[PDB]
RNA sequence: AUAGGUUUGGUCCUAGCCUUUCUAUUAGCUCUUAGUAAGAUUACACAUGCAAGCAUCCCCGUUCCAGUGAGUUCACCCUCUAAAUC
């Protein structure tokens, strides 16, 4: 269609079955259905662990470069994965929620020691 | 400088040793069948068709690259101790690209230590076969690549197809490719079916393996028994070039060995059953006195 | 610094094109300004309801 | 064809399916086959085979029992042959039938 | 219990011959074109149906990855395809077990199947690239500074802290706490 | 979802948007992170934007572009 | 039997068996040919056998055929810049004219191969889309990844039975 | 295409009505200061502004 | 450049009854998807001619216009390729009725 | 279609109708478990509950998603070019 106002968005699209998720990195317009008209599929993210166990993710880094240089507004889980990868700096919230658990384990360590 | 597998001289020598049996290169295989086509030609066009069949047999008989093993990669790109302890399972990543060659694209792993380690060789092969699948390769290693199963196909004399399966599954610079190839070569040296690996592209590879880690005794044995005599000599010649500091080589340029002598020299110098080599030459020359009398 | 992977591809690309050129891949940052969460907007780029 | 020994063949009959014309036409055609040696003798050329299963290898099936003709066969470009629209339909994939390639029992 | 024996016995050459096991069976159906699927199971419960199929008629014909003669009986010889269930007359159950058995024999070695010579995966076989060689290490990595210093906690001045409190009092939450290091 | 003309409900005719408890050092260090990130990914975005513009400009008119154009024209003549 | 003298001309392999893939400069091809005369037999056979092959491969080029208007058979090419190439065909043959136009105003093998390479760039092996465009639809296949529930039941880590 | 004259006319008079009888700033951001409810808007104010 | 689809079209003049306009008939070859034989299909084009130089029956090359003049005039005359009867052999620039040379080529 | 049944006293030809195959909905009779896909007939009338917030006041969003198949060649390519994202 047209969608009055809007931009492209590198985002994740769910495409699996119940209790078995899968996200395909898609460069779709923001005002479009989640699973819908994507301009270019840029990658895939299988979040369930392998039999060996490696949680595979894939990225057409060159085409992601092209669409970012064309004006794609990357969404927050995409920023997380690109930090995890190393194409983008580690996201602030992925270090902040880290330090929130670090101190939460401590809250437990001390309480546990008092119990013992 | 020592010529490797891909020098012009050694590549031509290995070629003649292989041989081009058209009825073995282009052989009836049990695939899906379509009705055969028919043509009517003269003797000249029949000769042209055989020449083109020979050229296509050379194309099918181009030698696979024998290469050295690869150093197991262990290179930590980065280490985010702040991310350490957040995720439980690893997260492998692949620049799928489209035009970057597969030995040039970046595949990395993120571990629960925060380490952004570069992906290993096995993980690299697995990842490229997932995202860029090539016909034949299954990311789980085939169970046919074991001791008892490989021995079963060895007993059923299936060595060419062993090498074919190894080619499809594993990359030549990989350890498995080398181990499986060398175990097959030791097996065929133990019993010995050099006609079974003749006219196949994996002959030049058996030769280098044997000459480099020298066990070419059974090679010369079958070669002369089967009257492959320009071959035998070229095989010695290749041994003499690959080991130029051998006393056999010294005796070769001292005694101006130019033909069969080149072999007798080898027997009397480094052949582990030189009595058998020399004896089969005497029996070959007894048969030669016979067909020279026939001539 | 460039992010780790991007740094690796850049040093590898130039390593390939040829010149070794082992300087660190820095990028300029002073071009980017630092307007914080108090800077005001414009009323024509706005619209009263 | 089980009484004759023919094991692999395709056959479609159309027009009137009368049994006492079906058998007679079948025997007429099968007894008026032209064999490879007769073709080689009639044309003076080698009759050679090209299977896709073996490869580019030429397989001589019938050579003439007399002299070999040395003028090559005339490559008549764009041959004037009467084609069957059913064959061309099956080749181009516009033959849509829910009856054609059905899973049947042996022979 | 252990196969590879009956097909070399005498009763196999008495009941069958050099002929296939499945070359005597005709499935009863509404005439003309057969239904394009055989039954799902000759043996329901422990009862055998009216026309037992080629495999379900001689309890002795066991199916596994080592019964090579039966496997080559049910697979074609001039073409490397497994014969389909209407062709042979076997049930959907056995056909499935036969596909499993043929596959298991194929990657156990006790079955011949044509393997195509594959062409090399890549053209250049070098290993001289950054993903397959080393990289010159990061200043942070030869040191121990974290990549991008903004990841480390660094307490701002208490003047900024109290300015924050002046902005957000009342609903203000607790204090801070420099984050720990080796969380258990 | 709803449109501009759906009567608003009763349950939401009154509902306090009680805001989240603001912690202190996390808020300021989090701001210093948010600003650093926006800056470095802005730098990466400018790099990618100029690379795309470079690709467009050299594909339209580069040096190999003019080379193949003049070769095609000379071959035509 | 298919109707017509040479039924091979309407068989969709003969049409995509031609070799002339006109450049993007040509717009109009005009074929003036003579029905009688022993010299214009090449042009007559070129109209009969090869004009169908030219249009299938060059689908947007106007090909107009003119009969006995001039005493000599000839071809004309109106090109987008404004050009009017003339190729007389008297005392030639249809294969000769075929070769002639593939040399003069026809794309080269490198050009069609290169143009072909750009096409394959679209069908990408890694992409996971429905079987009309891609090759795999989920990673529920790649053996080693968790299967699709439907085929293999998932362990009791699934929700509901938590 | 049959012209949508009525739709165009309705658009035009809607625009002219919006231009002319536009509600002003006074009867817009005014405030019942006890319950924090503006009028003609009916929405109260966020928690950082009471 | 031009917003007109058809850039260059060779056609035939049907009528000159409108002032400074020629009604022209382009004939293109469209493939019957079933019969696979190319059948001529015609589209009527209205060309602008300023000099009233084309009569009915001429073959005319029409080029496009950057932007249509009238509702249907989207093309202009580029050449009266073949003038009714007065046709000059392009190969030998000597007049020719049809199949015969009015003026001889070996002049 | 690998085809078959049926005109007649009988045969041959032409021919219609039907059969055999696969899918979908509904009806009958009868039905154990587990997983998963899919799930008004009606553009007829709808009780009731919920589906649009956010936010230091401005704005922004409620023009999207989600739904339906009434109407029906406003969907594709090129030229030109306005919102829009860089
Ligand atoms: Zn059964
Ligand atoms: Zn799935």
SS3 track for G96-114: HHHHHHHHHCECCHHHHHH
Contact G154, G146 (CB under 8 A): yes
Q: Give the tokens for residue I54.
A: 């084309």
- Report CA-CA distances (Å) from B63 to B16, B231, E161, G136, H44: 12, 18, 73, 34, 82
Q: Collapsing DSSP states into helix, strand and coil, what is residue I39?
A: strand
CB count in 10 Å sphere of residue D70: 10
Between the CA of I70 and the C1' of J77, what is the distance in angstroms? 23
Q: Residue A66 C-alpha to ligand 2 middle, in angstroms?
A: 30
The C-alpha atoms of residue A61 and residue C3 are separated, in whole angstroms, by: 13
**Which of the 52-71 residues on chain G come under 7 Å of nucleic strand J at their beta carbon?**
none
Identify how the structure was determined: cryo-EM
Q: Give the tokens for residue D107.
A: 């022979």
Q: Give the tokens for residue G111.
A: 């050009």
The C-alpha atoms of residue B144 and residue B153 are separated, in whole angstroms, by: 9
Tally the residues of chain E. Answer: 184
Q: Give the tokens for residue I55.
A: 């009569």
Is B138 within 8 Å of chain A by CB? no
**Which of the 16-75 residues on chain I come under 7 Å of nucleic strand J at their beta carbon?**
none
Phi-psi region of A86 (alpha: psi -120 to 50; beta: other; left: phi over 0): left
The C-alpha atoms of residue G107 and residue B184 are separated, in whole angstroms, by: 51
CB pairs under 8 A between A and C: 12
Helix (H) or strand (E) holding D31: helix D19-31
CB count in 10 Å sphere of residue A11: 22
| DSSP 8-state symbol, H11 | H
Q: Which residues pair with I83 in a beta bridge?
A: none
Touching subunits for chain D (3+ Cβ pairs under 8 A): B, E, G
Q: Give the tokens for residue B20.
A: 């081009």
Chain J bases having any atom below 7 Å from a protein CB? 1-4, 12-14, 19-22, 34-37, 49-66, 77-80, 83-86
| DSSP 8-state symbol, G16 | G
Contact B65, B6 (CB under 8 A): yes
Contact B46, D60 (CB under 8 A): yes
The C-alpha atoms of residue G145 and residue B129 are separated, in whole angstroms, by: 13
The C-alpha atoms of residue G9 and residue G7 are separated, in whole angstroms, by: 5
| DSSP 8-state symbol, G51 | H
Shortest-distance ligand to the CA of residue A19: 2
- Chain G residues in contact with A43 by the CB 8 A cut-off are 126
**Which of the 63-92 residues on chain D come under 7 Å of nucleic strand J at their beta carbon?**
86
- Interrupted backbone of chain D, residues before each interruption (C–N > 2.5 Å): none
CB contact under 8 A, B106 and C5: yes
Strand nucleotide closest to residue F20 (CA to C1'):
J55
CB contact under 8 A, F26 and A88: no
Q: Give the tokens for residue B114.
A: 């925060």
Contact F15, H44 (CB under 8 A): no
CB pairs under 8 A between C and F: 18
Question: Which residue's structure tokens are 């199963």?
Answer: B149
Q: How would you label B88-118 residue by residue, b for 16+ Cβ within 10 Å and e otherwise?
A: eebbbbbbbbeebebbbbbbbbbbeebbbbb
**Which of the 5-24 residues on chain H come under 7 Å of nucleic strand J at their beta carbon?**
none
Q: Which of I61, E130, D44 is nearest to B107 (CA)?
A: E130
- Chain G residues in contact with B138 by the CB 8 A cut-off are 143
Label each residue of chain B as H, E or C.
CCCCCCCHHHHHHHHHHHCCCHHHHCCCCCCCCCCCEEEEECHHHHHHHHHHHHHHHHHHCCCCCCCCCCCCCCCEEEECCCCCCCCCCCEEEEECCCCCCCCCCCEEEECCCCEEEECCHHHHHHHHHHHCCCCCCCCCCCCCCCCHHHHHHHHCCCHHHHHHHHHHHCCCCCHHHHHHHHHHHHHHHHCCCCCCCCCCCCHHHHHHHHHHCCCCHHHHHHHHHCCCHHHHHHHHHHHHHHCCCCHHHHHHHHCCCCCHHHHHHHHHHHCCCHHHHHHHHHHHHHHHHHHHHHC
CB contact under 8 A, D83 and G7: yes
The C-alpha atoms of residue I34 and residue I42 are separated, in whole angstroms, by: 20
Helix (H) or strand (E) holding F25: helix F25-60
Q: Give the tokens for residue A53.
A: 């166990």
Question: Which residue's structure tokens are 């469209």?
Answer: I30
Touching subunits for chain B (3+ Cβ pairs under 8 A): A, C, D, E, G
Render C18-30 in DSSP notation, one character per residue.
Answer: S-----------T
CB-nearest to B89 from A55, A85, A98 is: A55
Interface test with C, best of F28, F32, F43 (most C CBs within 10 A): F43
CA E83 to chain centre: 22
Q: Give the tokens for residue G61.
A: 């080029």
Question: CA angle at residue I36 from I31 to I42, to 5 degrees?
Answer: 25
> Backbone phi, then psi, for G45, in 5-degree steps?
-65, -30
Contacts 24+ apart (CB under 8 A), G84-92: G86/I90, G86/I91, G88/I91, G89/G33, G89/G40, G89/G42, G89/G43, G89/G46, G90/G39, G90/G40, G90/G43, G90/I91, G91/G39, G91/G42, G92/G42, G92/G43
Q: Which of G71, G75, G73 is nearest to I101 (CA)?
A: G71
Is A96 within 8 Å of chain F by CB? yes
Sign of CA dihedral B166, B169, B172, B173: negative
CB count in 10 Å sphere of residue B239: 25
Query: Among the residues of H1-50, which ranges form H helices?
Result: 5-20, 26-29
Chain E residue nearest residue F28, CA to CA: E156
| DSSP 8-state symbol, A84 | H
- Report CA-CA distances (Å) from D103 to D6, D96, E85, I39: 21, 16, 8, 41
Helix (H) or strand (E) holding G133: none
CB-count burial class (<10 Å; 0-12, 13-18, 19+) for B246: middle
Q: Which residues contact B266 (CB under 8 A, 6 or more apart)?
A: B220, B236, B239, B248, B274, B277
The C-alpha atoms of residue G143 and residue D102 are separated, in whole angstroms, by: 32
| DSSP 8-state symbol, G82 | S
Q: Which of A101, A98, A26 is nearest to A64 (CA)?
A: A26
Chain H residue nearest residue F20, CA to CA: H47
CB contact under 8 A, E183 and A99: no
Contact B82, A98 (CB under 8 A): yes
Is G11 within 8 Å of chain D by CB? yes
Label each residue of I58-101 as H, E or C.
CEEEEEECCCCCCCCEEEEEEEEEECCCCEECCCCCCEECCCCC
Please give, rounded to a whole number of angstroms, the shortest distance from the CA of E178 to a CA of chain B.
Answer: 13
First CA to last CA across chain F, in angstroms?
A: 64
Chains F and A touch (3+ CB pairs under 8 A): yes
Q: Give the tokens for residue A89.
A: 């700096």
Statement: the CB of D9 is under 7 Å from strand J: no
Chains E and I touch (3+ CB pairs under 8 A): no
Could you tell me the residue ranges of all domains in chain A? 1-115
Contact G61, G79 (CB under 8 A): no
Q: Which of D49, D51, D106, D58 is nearest to B30 (CA)?
A: D51
Q: Which of E13, G125, G115, D105 is nearest to B131 (CA)?
A: G125
CB count in 10 Å sphere of residue H43: 9
β-strand pairing of I73-82 with I59-64: antiparallel
Q: Which residues pair with D62 in a beta bridge?
A: D47
Q: Give the tokens for residue B198.
A: 């003749």
Is B131 within 8 Å of chain G by CB? yes
CB-nearest to A89 from C3, C8, C9 is: C3
Statement: the CB of E170 is under 7 Å from strand J: no
Q: Give the tokens for residue C32.
A: 């980017």
| DSSP 8-state symbol, D2 | T
Q: What is the CA radius of gyration of chain G?
A: 26
Chain C residue nearest residue E136, CA to CA: C22
Q: Give the tokens for residue E93.
A: 């159950």
Contact G53, G18 (CB under 8 A): yes
- Note the resolution in Å, 1 decimal: 2.9
Is C22 within 8 Å of chain E by CB? yes
The C-alpha atoms of residue G138 and residue A17 are separated, in whole angstroms, by: 10
The C-alpha atoms of residue D10 and residue D20 are separated, in whole angstroms, by: 20
CB count in 10 Å sphere of residue B199: 20
């Amino acid at each position: 269609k047209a969608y009055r106002g809007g931009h492209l968005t590198i985002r994740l699209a769910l495409g699996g079955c119940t209790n078995r998720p899968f996200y395909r990195i898609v460069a779709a317009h923001n005002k479009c259905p989640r699973d819908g008209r994507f301009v270019e599929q840029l990658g895939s993210y299988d979040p369930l662990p392998n039999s060996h166990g490696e949680k595979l993710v894939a990225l057409n880094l060159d085409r992601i470069r092209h669409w970012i240089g064309c004006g794609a507004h990357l969404s927050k889980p995409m920023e997380k994965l690109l930090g995890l990868a190393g194409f983008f700096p580690l996201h602030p919230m992925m270090i902040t929620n880290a330090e929130r658990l670090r101190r939460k384990r401590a809250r437990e360590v001390l309480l546990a020691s008092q119990k013992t | 400088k020592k010529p490797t597998f891909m020098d012009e001289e050694v590549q031509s020598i290995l070629t003649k040793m292989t041989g081009l049996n058209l009825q073995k290169t282009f052989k009836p295989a049990i695939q899906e069948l379509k009705p055969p086509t028919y043509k009517l030609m003269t003797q000249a066009q029949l000769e042209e068709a055989t020449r083109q069949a020979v050229e296509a047999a050379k194309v099918r008989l181009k030698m696979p690259p024998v290469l050295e093993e690869r150093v197991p990669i262990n290179d930590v790109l980065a280490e985010d101790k702040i991310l350490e302890g957040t995720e439980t399972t690893k997260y492998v990543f692949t620049d799928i690209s489209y035009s970057i060659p597969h030995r040039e694209r970046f595949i990395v792993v993120r571990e629960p230590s925060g380490t952004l380690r570069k992906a290993s060789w096995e993980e690299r092969d697995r990842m490229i076969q997932v995202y860029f699948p090539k016909e034949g390769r299954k990311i789980l290693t085939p169970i046919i690549f074991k001791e008892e199963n490989l021995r079963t196909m060895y007993s059923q004399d299936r060595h060419v197809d062993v090498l074919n399966l190894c080619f499809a599954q594993f990359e030549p610079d990989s350890t498995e490719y080398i181990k499986v190839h060398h175990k097959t070569y030791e097996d065929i040296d133990k019993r010995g079916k050099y006609d079974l690996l003749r006219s196949t592209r994996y002959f030049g590879g058996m030769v280098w393996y044997f000459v480099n880690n020298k066990k070419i005794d059974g090679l010369l044995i079958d070669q002369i028994q089967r009257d492959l005599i320009d071959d035998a000599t070229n095989l010695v010649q290749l041994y003499h070039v690959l080991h130029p500091d051998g006393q056999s080589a010294q005796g070769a340029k001292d005694q101006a060995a130019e033909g069969i002598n080149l072999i007798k020299v080898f027997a009397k110098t480094e052949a582990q059953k030189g009595a058998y080599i020399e004896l089969t030459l005497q029996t070959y020359q007894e048969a030669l006195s016979r067909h020279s009398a026939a001539s | 610094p460039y992010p780790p992977l991007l740094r690796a591809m850049i040093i590898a690309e130039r390593q390939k094109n040829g010149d070794t050129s082992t300087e660190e891949p820095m990028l300029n940052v002073q071009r980017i300004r630092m307007e914080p969460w108090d800077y005001p907007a414009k009323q024509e780029d706005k619209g009263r309801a | 064809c089980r009484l004759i020994g023919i094991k692999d063949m395709y056959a479609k009959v159309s027009g009137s399916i009368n049994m006492l014309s079906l058998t007679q036409g079948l025997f007429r055609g099968l007894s008026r086959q032209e064999t490879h040696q007769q073709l080689a003798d009639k044309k003076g050329l080698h009759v050679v085979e090209i299977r896709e299963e073996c490869g580019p290898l030429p397989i001589v099936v019938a050579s003439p029992r007399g002299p070999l003709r040395k003028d090559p066969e005339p490559e008549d470009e764009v041959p004037d042959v009467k084609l069957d629209w059913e064959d061309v339909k099956t080749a181009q994939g516009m033959k849509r039938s829910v009856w054609s390639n059905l899973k049947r029992a042996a022979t | 219990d252990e196969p590879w024996k009956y097909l070399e016995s005498e009763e196999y050459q008495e009941r069958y011959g050099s002929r296939p096991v499945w070359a005597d069976y005709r499935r009863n159906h509404k005439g003309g074109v057969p239904p394009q699927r055989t039954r799902k199971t000759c043996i329901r419960r422990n009862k055998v149906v009216g026309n037992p199929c080629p495999i379900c008629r001689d309890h002795k014909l066991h199916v596994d990855f080592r019964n090579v003669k039966l496997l080559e009986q049910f697979v074609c010889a001039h073409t490397g395809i497994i014969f389909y269930a209407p062709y042979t007359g076997v049930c959907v159950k056995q056909h499935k077990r036969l596909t499993q058995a043929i596959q298991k024999a194929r990657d156990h070695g006790l079955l011949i199947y044509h393997i195509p010579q594959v062409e090399p995966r890549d053209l250049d076989f070098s290993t001289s690239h950054g993903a397959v060689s080393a990289t010159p290490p990061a200043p942070t990595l030869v040191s121990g500074d974290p990549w991008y210093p903004w990841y480390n906690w660094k307490q701002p001045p208490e003047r900024e802290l109290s300015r924050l409190r002046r902005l957000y009092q009342g609903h203000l939450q607790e204090e801070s706490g420099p984050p720990p290091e080796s969380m258990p | 979802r709803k449109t501009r003309h759906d009567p608003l409900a009763k349950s939401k005719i009154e509902r306090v948007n009680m805001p989240p408890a603001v912690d202190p050092a996390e808020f300021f260090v989090l701001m210093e992170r948010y600003q650093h990130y926006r800056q470095t990914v802005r730098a990466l975005r400018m790099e990618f934007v100029s690379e795309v513009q470079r690709k467009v400009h050299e594909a339209r008119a580069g040096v190999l572009a003019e080379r193949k154009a003049l070769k095609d024209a000379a071959e035509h003549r | 039997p298919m109707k017509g003298r040479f039924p091979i001309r309407r068989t969709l392999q003969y049409l995509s068996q031609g070799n002339v893939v006109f450049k993007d400069s040509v717009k109009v091809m005009t074929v003036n040919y003579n029905t009688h005369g022993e010299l214009g037999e090449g042009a007559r056979k070129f109209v009969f056998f090869n004009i169908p092959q030219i249009q299938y491969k060059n689908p947007w080029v106007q090909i107009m055929m003119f009969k006995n208007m001039t005493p000599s058979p000839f071809l004309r090419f109106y090109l987008d810049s404004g050009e009017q190439v003339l190729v007389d065909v008297e005392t030639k043959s249809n294969k000769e004219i075929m070769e002639h136009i593939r040399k003069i105003l026809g794309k080269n093998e490198e050009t069609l191969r290169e143009e072909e390479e750009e096409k394959k760039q679209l069908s990408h092996p890694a992409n996971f889309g429905p079987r009309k465009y891609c090759l795999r639809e989920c990673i529920c296949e790649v053996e080693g990844q968790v299967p699709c529930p439907s085929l293999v039941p998932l362990p009791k880590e699934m929700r509901g039975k938590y | 295409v049959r012209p949508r004259l009525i739709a165009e006319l309705a658009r035009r008079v809607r625009a002219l009505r919006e231009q002319l009888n536009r509600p002003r700033d006074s009867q817009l951001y005014a405030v019942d200061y006890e319950t924090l409810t503006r009028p003609f808007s009916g929405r109260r104010l966020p928690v950082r502004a009471w | 450049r031009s917003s007109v689809h058809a850039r260059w079209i060779v056609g035939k003049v049907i009528g000159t009854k409108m002032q400074k306009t020629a009604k022209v008939r382009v004939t293109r070859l469209v493939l019957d998807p079933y019969l696979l034989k190319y059948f001529n299909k015609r589209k009527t084009y209205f060309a602008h001619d300023a000099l009233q130089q084309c009569t009915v029956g001429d073959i005319v090359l029409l080029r496009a216009l950057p932007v249509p003049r009238a509702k249907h005039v989207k093309h202009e005359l580029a050449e009266i390729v073949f003038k009714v009867g007065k046709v000059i052999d392009p190969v030998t620039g000597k007049p020719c009725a049809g199949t015969t040379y009015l003026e001889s080529p070996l002049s």
